[PDB]
Ligand SMILES: C[C@]1(C(=O)NC[C@]2(N)[C@@H]3C[C@H]4C[C@@H](C3)C[C@@H]2C4)CN(S(=O)(=O)c2ccc(N3C(=O)CCC3=O)nc2)CCO1
Ligand SMILES: Nc1nccc(-c2c(-c3ccc(F)cc3)ncn2C2CCNCC2)n1
Ligand SMILES: [Ca+2]
Ligand SMILES: [Ca+2]
């Protein structure tokens with residue numbers, strides 16, 4: 001392909017002539033994103049230019065990580081790849097990586113903020129998050145920072161999870177075991193996040209808007225109740241355990257007295273997601289079977305992922321080795337068919 005250059009976000013982008021009318025649509029993880037028109041297919045796409053992908057061993061491995069992950073993700077509610085390109089003609093010239101996915105116009109914050117959502121619409125939004133989570137979790141991939149700004153949505157409320165498996169960030173949706181660095185966690189960290197998101201879709205208000213990690217924990221405990229001694233097992237810091245243990249005991253609230261006028265099935269699902277005991281938290285696959293989603297649930301259309309080889313994560317390699325592996329993954333990429341779906 002012939003490439004052209006255009007200054008976007010104060011830096012030069014070099015992209016194939018296939019992609020036209022680039023326009024900035026915000027930052028991404030380790031990069032920045034432009035909307036574009038794919039002249040090959042007439043489809044709208046989003047192109048992410050990674051920022052300094054091989055500047056350091058940290059950038060280089062995270063570039064490889066992200067490319068490997070996105071090449072593996074093939075699910076309608078998870079960001080995956082239509083294309084990946086570089087202006088480099090050889091490994092020796094290779095210093096820039098661009099990732100292409102279908103364009104999604106907004107994030108979940110754009111949906112709820114100016115819109116009184118119906119319960120049927122909330123069901124659809126949460127259903128899609130859970131469908132995507134079932135898929136990524138089945139490949140032993142966890143998001144760990146799921147939140148409305150990491151949920152891409154389009155003009156028809158179709159939703160995809162992004163920035164999974166990888167500046168002041170909001171902590172309001174993080175699982176307590178993540179926010180407080182507890183010693184053990186599982187895939188259900190993301191289910192806590194879904195509960196926080198769903199609660200906000202039902203009320204219009206952030207569920208746990210803490211000003212710091214201690215304020216947020218206090219808000220959490222007011223809803224779910226003081227934890228038992230067994231939960232302290234997970235907390236390394238003695239000062240943290242002593243503090244939590246010292247707090248005045250609080251009962252769990254009945255969520256039916258919290259989410260007023262909500263579908264009782266929504267309240268029941270929230271009770272199963274917003275539990276401190278991550279071994280008692282509902283899984284994504286279990287949640288998809290909950291009656292709240294009855295009108296959407298379809299077991300034939302809730303697939304799992306192919307096995308995902310993450311052995312590279314334990315390895316320390318040199319920058320040029322991560323760079324060469326990344327180049328290999330660029331070159332071996334096989335674009336998917338434009339139409340990959342059929343009537344049920
Ligand atoms: C959850 C809620 C709320 O108490 N927030 C305070 C807390 N953050 C605080 C105190 C305890 C424990 C912790 C710390 C978590 C919360 C509860 C509820 N209020 S509402 O009552 O004004 C309302 C507002 C809306 C709705 N609604 C509908 O209108 C339809 C469905 C639905 O849920 N239902 C209720 C708005 C703000 O968000
Ligand atoms: N508009 C749009 N549409 C799809 C994806 C993105 C996108 C990507 C991204 C990831 C991989 C890829 F290959 C291409 C783009 N990273 C962050 N975002 C946006 C997510 C919503 N807030 C603005 C940034 N943005
Ligand atoms: Ca119940
Ligand atoms: Ca169906």
Ligand SMILES: [Ca+2]
Pocket residue numbers: 339340341342343
């Ligand atoms: Ca088709």
Ligand SMILES: [Ca+2]
Pocket residue numbers: 300344
């Ligand atoms: Ca079927």
Ligand SMILES: [Cl-]
Pocket residue numbers: 147148149150170
């Ligand atoms: Cl967010």
